[PDB]
From Swiss-Prot:
Organism: Homo sapiens
Name under which the protein is recorded: Apolipoprotein(a)
Subunit structure and binding partners: Disulfide-linked to apo-B100. Binds to fibronectin and decorin.
Misc note: Apo(a) is known to be proteolytically cleaved, leading to the formation of the so-called mini-Lp(a). Apo(a) fragments accumulate in atherosclerotic lesions, where they may promote thrombogenesis. O-glycosylation may limit the extent of proteolytic fragmentation. Homology with plasminogen kringles IV and V is thought to underlie the atherogenicity of the protein, because the fragments are competing with plasminogen for fibrin(ogen) binding.
Glycosylation sites: 75
Record domain Kringle: where: 1-79
Superkingdom, taxonomy of origin: Eukaryota
SS bonds (residue pairs): 2-79, 23-62, 51-74
């Protein structure tokens, strides 16, 4: 799918960044320790490692499984 507006409402299952890296799961603290967990943020759809925009960025993003790259925008297009 594409995402609407800034992607805050996106709930698809895409999990890949603009550089081809894989999204880290929101519930996981490895490789990146963070606070953006579904426990902490229950209505933002932070399911598995799916691309999401819980913080009003400008597109869906995720923490990445590359330990040297904390987060990236996902390879999704605006609708
Ligand atoms: O490190 C990040 C990612 C921050 C980026 C994500 C893309 N939008 C710009 C900020 N988030 S974090 O570790 O949870 C985090 C770390 C410090 C402050 C806030 C914060 O997010 C939250 F508010 F949820 F606690
Ligand atoms: Cl959307």
């Amino acid at each position: 799918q594409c995402y609407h507006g800034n992607g805050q409402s996106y709930r698809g299952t895409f999990s890949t960044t603009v550089t081809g890296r894989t999204c880290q799961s929101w519930s996981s603290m490895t490789p990146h320790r963070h606070q953006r967990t579904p426990e902490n943020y229950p209505n933002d759809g932070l399911t598995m490692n799916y691309c999401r925009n819980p913080d009003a960025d400008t597109g869906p993003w995720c923490f990445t499984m590359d330990p040297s790259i904390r987060w990236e925008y996902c390879a999704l297009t605006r609708c």
